[PDB]
Every structure is written in structure tokens, then in C-alpha cells.
Amino acid sequence: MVQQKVEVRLKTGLQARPAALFVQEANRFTSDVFLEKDGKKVNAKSIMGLMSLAVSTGTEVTLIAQGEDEQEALEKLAAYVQEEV
Amino acid sequence: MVQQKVEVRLKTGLQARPAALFVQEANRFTSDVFLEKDGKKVNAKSIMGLMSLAVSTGTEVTLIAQGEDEQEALEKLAAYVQEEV
């Protein structure tokens, strides 16, 4: 019989489900999505593109949308990425 | 054409793959696994048990193993949960 306390350190990030919705909102777009962070860059709104890299608490991402349908960018992606209540 | 910077806030935690390995290591056990955190408690090493709740950076978990095969608890789970290099 034994018992000792420990700490957590496992990986941390956005599962594969959230990333699926990320593109869904853009699905109603018509411009172009581009996420730039830590000098790194991904194809755009690709699912595997994000799931490939990783982020942390406090981090940030540069969302760029050029066009008219860019609405979903500021409208949805902004409110969504902000988990507004 | 538009373009504005933003910040990340999406959810954060251990995907469903890591949790699958958590039990794998215990699969070679024979005692009992119990994780207690934030007064909360899960069946034990259940996959859906953890995926159900959530954790954060700096957080901790109380791993309890009572028995002889408790080796995997201190041996593997400790080194694993510590992501030792």
C-alpha cells in the first residue's frame, strides 16, 4: 500500500473538435484567413494547420481577412475566439 | 479589404489521445488509481472520467495507488506525468 501526491504537466491546447468549428464559421466567408503567431504561419484556416502547431495561455494570434465577406472574421471569429458570454 | 489583430482564448487541456495512454500504463497495474483535484474526484483512471473535467497550467492532481503493483504509479505515471526528458 502506497500513496504520494503529484503535479500535472501533460500537454495543453485546443482539441480537434474546436478547430473543426473554426473553419465552419469561415465557411461562410469569401476572402482569406491567415493566422500568424511566434513568427510562425499556417496555410490559413486549415484544420491540420493549427492542430499541427500549439499555443498557450495568454498567447495571441494574428487573424487577417481581406475582402467584404470579412464580416465573419470580425463578427463571428472575434466573438467566438473571445468566448464571449 | 480589412485586417485586425486578436488574441487567443479557446479552451485548453489534454486531448483524447493522451488520456488513452494514461490508462495504458496502469493497464499493467493491479492496485487502484484515484485522481483528486479541486475537491473533485473521478471514478479513477477512466478515460471519460478525466476528459469530463478539465485542468490548467500549474494545476496538480492527487494520484493514489494502494498495493504492490503500485510501481507503475510512481515509476511510469510519475515520469510520464512529468514529461521527463
UniProtKB/Swiss-Prot annotation, chains A, B:
Domain of life: Bacteria
One Pfam family cited in the UniProt record for this chain: PTS-HPr
InterPro entries to which the protein is assigned, alphabetical: HPr, HPr-like, HPr-like_sf, PTS_HPr_Ser_P_site
Modified residues (Phosphoserine): S46
Domain HPr: 1-85
PROSITE patterns in alphabetical order: PTS_HPR_DOM (PS51350), PTS_HPR_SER (PS00589)
CDD domains: PTS-HPr_like
Phosphoprotein in keyword set: yes
GO biological process, one term: phosphoenolpyruvate-dependent sugar phosphotransferase system
Keywords on record: Phosphoprotein
Function: Along with seryl-phosphorylated HPr, phosphorylated Crh is implicated in carbon catabolite repression (CCR) of levanase, inositol dehydrogenase, and beta-xylosidase. Exerts its effect on CCR by interacting with CcpA.
Oligomer status and interactors: Mixture of monomers and homodimers. Interacts with CcpA as a monomer.
Misc. remarks from the entry: Not phosphorylated by PEP and by enzyme I.
UniProt similarity note: Belongs to the HPr family.
Protein name (database record): HPr-like protein Crh
Gene name of the record: crh
